[PDB]
Design a protein around this ligand. Structure first.
Ligand SMILES: CN(c1ncccc1CNc1c(C#N)cnc2[nH]c(-c3ccccc3)cc12)S(C)(=O)=O
Ligand SMILES: CN(c1ncccc1CNc1c(C#N)cnc2[nH]c(-c3ccccc3)cc12)S(C)(=O)=O
Lengths: 271, 258
């Protein structure tokens, strides 16, 4: 059981918003002052909303990986809260932007490698993430990145259903079979990981800048692909282009991606 | 991959495939003057469609290179059209397990399940769905070596199929894991078939009601727990071949230590 008493939580400032409501930072008095992320649920007095929200905690509870945010616990009494591990250094895109001159290439490859370990782990549990993008990656330390909460990562996908959402469908990250037929598989996750690796090597710059979402599929179906980032090792760019094979059966699996990223990281650290 | 006919000595017929008899033979080449081979023949290869379908079976095998999958040696495109495959000298696994029933040690049975998991992890790495994983499709190269046989020769097996395959004709990497679970059960059962006495039409009802194949006599409990994971009704709850291979390696080490 992972039920937590509310008195042990000090609710701090709002750090973002999810589909169910504001996400706050806070402190969990367990150590007596652990930093946490707290998902809140504005419509949780409705049984169906409460079930959908608590299912997001059940989803995270099944995973245990060094590069995925951990579920700390739940408060099932109103207001219903989900307590997650806080990654103290924040969002990966902002972190890479601040260090666009500071961070070394070996650190960028390390983050792609750590993410491939988390994704090989999800693949081993037959879990399809659906939104592998730098926006859904957090920074725990200078040498550690983690995939953020999975419910919160579906914010862009879910934006089509929420009139007040600031989000937009993540077309620029999606595999063609996902855009065309709404098929989400372990192979479509590999395509998205390729785009995520491109974002990291680009220091948090978004893919297809200036291109309208509606114009993405036509470019991809005409054979267009994201260019090699400046300073990206050619072996790493060849890996990204394999992730973007139009035929999903031609894309590598995460076991091979992790092994190849480990070799690329070793070769970079050696020079 | 073209081979000259006189460089093949056609021996005895060892089985039959959809296109015709399969023979054992000898291939003489500068690499090996007397390599033992399996020869797939094609009785109606004068028909263009039959010839194309037959040669596609060689193309399928040509893309794979694994120690536990039979290798394609080459093809003879001139009539009669032949496909030359690596020979597994000890024959079919089911017959082999039946003969050596009292002879074979438990560690050997676990080794065969392990070697098959390495071949299947390799197919999974290339996103290839086999669809016909069963002891009938496994051959014996030596006392310490098994291989998946020709994929064309390997072509309803209701008693081996995942429920989503029976119900909706969905064949995925997860349905291959379900079949591999049944294959491991067959090996530990010394080549006995699953669900003996049950009509094919009655299998799905049993499966839906939570029934599963029982723990074979002398099967280590850790190995039976692995088989029961392969038979999770929800395909997303089934393990992948990388985990199966790692777990089978541990089970094999524990058995070899005794
Ligand atoms: C971007 N994501 C979010 N999406 C919507 C709302 C809020 C977030 C940030 N969530 C987290 C989580 C989770 N789960 C863990 N640690 C965290 N640390 C921080 C943070 C720390 C310092 C400064 C700024 C942000 C946020 C944060 S995610 C990765 O969860 O999909
Ligand atoms: C069972 N299979 C078959 N199905 C139909 C016809 C023939 C076979 C056996 N084929 C082989 C192969 C292939 N491919 C390789 N080595 C082989 N050695 C033998 C053999 C050796 C000695 C005695 C009896 C058989 C057969 C054989 S399979 C696994 O290929 O699907």
């Amino acid at each position: 059981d992972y039920e937590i008493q509310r008195e042990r939580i000090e609710l701090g400032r709002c750090i973002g918003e999810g589909q169910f409501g504001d996400v706050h930072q806070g402190i969990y008095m367990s150590n007596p002052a652990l930093a946490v992320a707290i998902k809140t649920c504005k419509n949780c007095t409705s049984d169906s909303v409460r079930e959908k929200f608590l299912q997001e905690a059940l989803t995270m509870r099944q995973f245990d990986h060094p590069h995925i945010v951990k579920l700390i616990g739940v408060i099932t009494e109103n207001p219903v809260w989900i307590i997650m591990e806080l990654c103290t250094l924040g969002e990966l895109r902002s972190f890479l932007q601040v260090r666009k001159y500071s961070l070394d290439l070996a650190s960028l490859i390390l983050y792609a490698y750590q993410l491939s370990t988390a994704l090989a782990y999800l693949e081993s549990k037959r879990f399809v993430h659906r939104d592998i993008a730098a926006r859904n990656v957090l920074v725990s330390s200078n040498d550690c990145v983690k995939l953020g909460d999975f419910g919160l990562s579906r914010y862009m996908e879910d934006s089509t259903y929420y009139k007040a959402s600031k989000g937009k469908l993540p077309i620029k990250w999606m595999a063609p079979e996902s855009i065309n037929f709404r098929r989400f598989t372990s192979a479509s996750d590999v395509w998205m990981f390729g785009v995520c690796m491109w974002e990291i090597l680009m220091h948090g710059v978004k893919p297809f800048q200036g291109v309208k979402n509606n114009d993405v599929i036509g470019r991809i179906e005409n054979g267009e692909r994201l260019p090699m980032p400046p300073n990206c090792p050619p072996t790493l760019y060849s890996l990204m282009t394999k992730c973007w094979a139009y035929d999903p059966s031609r894309r590598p699996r995460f076991t091979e991606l992790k092994a190849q990223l480990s070799t690329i990281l070793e070769e970079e650290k050696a020079q």
